[PDB]
Structure 1
Amino acid sequence: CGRFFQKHQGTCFYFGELPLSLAACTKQWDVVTYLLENPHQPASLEATDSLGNTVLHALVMIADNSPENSALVIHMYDSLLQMGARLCPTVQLEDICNHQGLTPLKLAAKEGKIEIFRHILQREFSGLYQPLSRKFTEWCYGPVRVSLYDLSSVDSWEKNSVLEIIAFHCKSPHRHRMVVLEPLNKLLQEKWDRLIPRFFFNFACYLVYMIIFTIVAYHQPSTFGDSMLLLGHILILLGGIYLLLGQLWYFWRRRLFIWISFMDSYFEILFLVQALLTVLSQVLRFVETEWYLPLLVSSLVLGWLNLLYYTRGFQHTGIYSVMITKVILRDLLRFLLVYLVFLFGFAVALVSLSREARPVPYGGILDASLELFKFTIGMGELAFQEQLRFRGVVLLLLLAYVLLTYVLLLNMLIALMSETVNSVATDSWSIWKLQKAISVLEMENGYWWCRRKRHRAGRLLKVGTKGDGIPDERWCFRVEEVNWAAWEKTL
């Protein structure tokens, strides 16, 4: 253990701070073997370090997405697993916890390392070394083949599963690529299929709440009708309190997501803001303050965008919603920056000019800004003011603004949006699939007032006999396929 050996930012190389770990990470199978069969003192393959990592954790840590490193770590991982099987067949190394609490599989999920993750998630060996396998090929009657994926520590029924780690704990930017791989993809799809009624029931409840809010806001002044109005107002107050409580509970359960996750969810903040504004407006009405109505209409505006939140339940519209935000983030802000820099200077020049003759246009900065914005919205008044003393200068400034902000900047913005839409076609699909995974994981848990019962996934299929006793049971997920090439290879 030392500064050079710990994992930090600078001059370091973490390898597990163990001679066996170093030998495994340095690509020498002979040295790794020899340490194990020493008559003097064999090296325990289940030893840990200060962080608690084992030889298998260290391989995951040093893994990259490059082809050669992935191949090396995969081969070494498989070899060490077989060596552990032959040496110690009682203890299994895959389920060794860490000081943090993770396993070698969960480290791959939390660290964003995808190659070793996909290899470990779906692996199968030949006749020898069956027990240490994840994918099992069952009956092969013709070209139809049925695969069984091990659901251990990857199903959301447990406490800290792989899906929850990917959705709420992974630091990687492109952590969505992990939710579009075989097992996860199928499992998430069937979970979502089981959750259609509850999702659309939540959508209907929010729609009804928004309709009631709209009715209350519309029919409000500056008996039966008064009683209905008061009932609507109190119902809105309770609804806002409910939404605020839900948002606060979500924020408290995942205290640390707000840094990792902004591109994908980005609606919990909006829901929190809408609930806060609604509650604040309702409580401020009791004081009879004049700033009720702006707050109420702001909440009314923000509600329908959350209605658009609920709209991402279909493939076309979900990818469209993802693309909207990606276009906004990638290129709308640079255009606004340049646009306001152009606008402010020209508006100030127009205001400072045209103060002496030969109401008054460009009286102040706000009026000039409004006129120059009317230019971009297609309603720009471009006339040759005859009463001004600097008519030609004003006309030239207006023409220079028009040909440099309207002809150039807007069309260039269209071109940049075209490029952005072309570039991010495949990414939006995975982002939407991850969004669905997050929604499914959230709906699996109940609301802040009632908790759902955990429905286990997969069937209890016997996968043979191990070397410790007759039973060997594990929960597996079944998938059918019709593959003709693989079938014809096996004959």
Structure 2
Amino acid sequence: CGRFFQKHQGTCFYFGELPLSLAACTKQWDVVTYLLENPHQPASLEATDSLGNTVLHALVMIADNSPENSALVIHMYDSLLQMGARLCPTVQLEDICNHQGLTPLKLAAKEGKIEIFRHILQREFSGLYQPLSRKFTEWCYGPVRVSLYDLSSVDSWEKNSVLEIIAFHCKSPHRHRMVVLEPLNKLLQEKWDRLIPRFFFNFACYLVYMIIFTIVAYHQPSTFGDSMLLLGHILILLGGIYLLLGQLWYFWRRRLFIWISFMDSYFEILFLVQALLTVLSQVLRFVETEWYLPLLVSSLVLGWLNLLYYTRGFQHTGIYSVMIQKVILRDLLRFLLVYLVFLFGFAVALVSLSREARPVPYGGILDASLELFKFTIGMGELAFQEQLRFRGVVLLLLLAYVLLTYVLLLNMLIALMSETVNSVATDSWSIWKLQKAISVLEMENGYWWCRRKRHRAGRLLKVGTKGDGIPDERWCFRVEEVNWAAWEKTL
């Protein structure tokens, strides 16, 4: 436990700072064997390092998505697990919480290791070491396979799970690609199917709230009608407070999330902002302030925009929303930066000119900026002002602005969004599936007020018999698949 071995930034190599973990991470097949079966003093296999990692944890940590690294880690992981079963079966190595409280599988999920993660997520052995298997197969009557994936440490019923870690705790750049693996893609799809009723109920409740909010905002002061207006107003205030509390509790209960991925969610921010603006609008109305209407109307616009959070319970539209987000975040902010630099330069230029003659156009910076933006939206006034003494200079400056902005930058923006839409096609699907996963995981636990009862997916199916007497049981996710490539080899 020094400085080179400890995990940090710079010159380093983490291997668990145990001689056995070093041998395992260094492909020392024989040294580990001698350490384990030296008669003088056998080497323990459950031994933890100062950080809490075991040899299996360490093999995960060094794991990288390189094919050779993945092959090495997989081989040594399997072999060491088999050896651990052989030497001391009584102790289950796969379930050892390090100081962070993560098992090797959860650790692989959090640390982004995908190849070792998927391998651990679906592995099977022969008759011997069979209990050390996550994927099973009950019967193969015909070409069908009843695959039983172990749901241990991966179902959402437990306090902390691989699904929750991937959704919220993982900070990997492309964690959206781990929620499309076999067990996860099927379990998540089943959970989504079970939750479609509640997703649509949330959508319908929010849509009703926005309808009421639109009706109230459309009919406001500039009997029965007054009473209906009042009840609608109080309903809007209550709904705004409800959404505010929901978002606040989403953040407090999940206060360790913003730093991982600020823009992954980016609708809880927008929902929070909309609810805050609504409640703030109401309170200022109580204060009788003229700044009510802008805030209430901003809340209206933002809520109607937020509806497109819900529009992505559909394959067809959710990928569209994801791809809108990618377009905005990739090739719209650059365009806005460059465009606004151009526009400010040309606007102050035109204002500087057109100030000496021979309803004044380009009177100030705001007017010139608005005229240039008009050019952007297809209604720029491109005339030869005869009154100002620099007619030609102003016209040439406008023509240069048009060439640089309308002909070059806007069409190039179309080209860039073509390129980005083409680039993010499969990743859009994966990211949408991750969005569904996140929504499912949030829907599983109830609202901020309702303590929802968990529903533990999978079947308590007795699989094999452990190296003991009375047999064992285990929760598995039962999956049917029609396969012929495997079936021709079982004969």
TM-score under structure 1 normalisation?
0.99
Q: Displacement of 1:97 after TM fit?
A: 1.2
CA distance in 2, matches of 1:188, 1:24: 34
**Greater Cα shift, 354-363 or 425-434:** 354-363
CA distance in 2, matches of 1:334, 1:45: 54
Q: Displacement of 1:261 after TM fit?
A: 2.2
For the residue of structure 1 that corresponds to 2:146, the secondary structure is strand
CA deviation string 1:33-59 (max 9, x = no partner): 011111110000011111111111111
Q: Displacement of 1:31 after TM fit?
A: 0.7
CA distance in 2, matches of 1:133, 1:269: 42
Q: Displacement of 1:357 after TM fit?
A: 1.6
CA deviation string 1:333-385 (max 9, x = no partner): 11111111111111111111122221111111111111111111111111111
CA contact (8 A) 1:24 1:76 kept: yes
For the residue of structure 1 that corresponds to 2:142, the secondary structure is coil
For the residue of structure 2 that corresponds to 1:375, the secondary structure is helix
CA distance in 1, matches of 2:19, 2:256: 36
CA distance in 2, matches of 1:404, 1:249: 48
User: Which residue number corresponds to residue 189 of structure 1?
Assistant: 189
Q: Displacement of 1:228 after TM fit?
A: 1.1
Q: Displacement of 1:470 after TM fit?
A: 2.7
User: Which residue number corresponds to residue 402 of structure 2?
Assistant: 402
User: Which residue number corresponds to residue 480 of structure 2?
Assistant: 480
Q: Displacement of 1:144 after TM fit?
A: 1.3
CA deviation string 1:363-418 (max 9, x = no partner): 11111111111111111111111112111111111111111211111111111111
Q: Displacement of 1:153 after TM fit?
A: 1.2
CA contact (8 A) 1:57 1:107 kept: yes
For the residue of structure 2 that corresponds to 1:350, the secondary structure is helix
Q: Displacement of 1:468 after TM fit?
A: 1.4
CA contact (8 A) 1:362 1:368 kept: yes
CA distance in 2, matches of 1:46, 1:69: 23
For the residue of structure 2 that corresponds to 1:264, the secondary structure is helix
CA distance in 2, matches of 1:219, 1:110: 51
User: Which residue number corresponds to residue 70 of structure 1?
Assistant: 70
CA deviation string 1:235-287 (max 9, x = no partner): 11111111100000000011111122234311000011011100001011111
For the residue of structure 2 that corresponds to 1:136, the secondary structure is strand
CA distance in 2, matches of 1:130, 1:403: 71
CA deviation string 1:104-149 (max 9, x = no partner): 1111011111011000010011121111111111211111121111
Q: Displacement of 1:308 after TM fit?
A: 1.1
CA contact (8 A) 1:151 1:477 kept: yes
CA distance in 1, matches of 2:355, 2:78: 82
CA deviation string 1:61-87 (max 9, x = no partner): 111000111100110011101111110
CA contact (8 A) 1:264 1:431 kept: no
For the residue of structure 1 that corresponds to 2:149, the secondary structure is strand
CA contact (8 A) 1:374 1:380 kept: yes
CA contact (8 A) 1:167 1:437 kept: yes
User: Which residue number corresponds to residue 382 of structure 2?
Assistant: 382
CA distance in 2, matches of 1:133, 1:355: 82
CA distance in 2, matches of 1:453, 1:355: 72
CA contact (8 A) 1:153 1:161 kept: yes
CA distance in 1, matches of 2:171, 2:409: 37
CA distance in 2, matches of 1:325, 1:166: 21
CA distance in 1, matches of 2:399, 2:442: 55
CA distance in 1, matches of 2:372, 2:486: 67
CA distance in 2, matches of 1:193, 1:248: 28
User: Which residue number corresponds to residue 39 of structure 2?
Assistant: 39
CA contact (8 A) 1:110 1:166 kept: yes
User: Which residue number corresponds to residue 101 of structure 2?
Assistant: 101
CA distance in 2, matches of 1:75, 1:199: 42
Unmatched runs of 5 consecutive residues or more in structure 2: none
Matched, 1:353 2:353: yes
Q: Displacement of 1:462 after TM fit?
A: 1.1
CA contact (8 A) 1:123 1:135 kept: yes
CA distance in 2, matches of 1:10, 1:238: 53
CA distance in 2, matches of 1:467, 1:357: 99
CA distance in 2, matches of 1:46, 1:356: 86
Q: Displacement of 1:451 after TM fit?
A: 1.2
Q: Displacement of 1:199 after TM fit?
A: 0.7
For the residue of structure 2 that corresponds to 1:302, the secondary structure is helix
CA deviation string 1:302-358 (max 9, x = no partner): 011111111110001000000001000111111111111111111111111122221
User: Which residue number corresponds to residue 56 of structure 2?
Assistant: 56
Q: Cα 1:326–1:112, aligned 2, differ >3 Å: closer, same or farther?
A: same
CA distance in 2, matches of 1:110, 1:474: 24
CA distance in 2, matches of 1:171, 1:187: 22
**Greater Cα shift, 118-127 or 383-392:** 383-392
Unmatched runs of 5 consecutive residues or more in structure 1: none
User: Which residue number corresponds to residue 255 of structure 1?
Assistant: 255
Q: Displacement of 1:222 after TM fit?
A: 1.2
The runs of at least 4 aligned residues of structure 1 exceeding 4 Å deviation read none
CA distance in 1, matches of 2:240, 2:395: 53
CA distance in 1, matches of 2:203, 2:162: 28
CA contact (8 A) 1:121 1:134 kept: yes
Q: Displacement of 1:293 after TM fit?
A: 0.6
For the residue of structure 2 that corresponds to 1:148, the secondary structure is strand
CA distance in 2, matches of 1:83, 1:126: 15
CA distance in 2, matches of 1:97, 1:337: 48
CA distance in 2, matches of 1:263, 1:224: 46
Q: Displacement of 1:230 after TM fit?
A: 1.1
For the residue of structure 2 that corresponds to 1:167, the secondary structure is helix
**How big is the alpha-carbon RMSD for the aligned residues of Structure 1 and Structure 2?**
0.9
CA distance in 2, matches of 1:13, 1:264: 31
CA distance in 2, matches of 1:92, 1:286: 63
For the residue of structure 2 that corresponds to 1:484, the secondary structure is coil
CA distance in 1, matches of 2:472, 2:279: 56
For the residue of structure 2 that corresponds to 1:408, the secondary structure is helix
CA deviation string 1:441-482 (max 9, x = no partner): 111001111111111111121112111123111011111111
CA distance in 1, matches of 2:334, 2:175: 26
For the residue of structure 2 that corresponds to 1:11, the secondary structure is coil
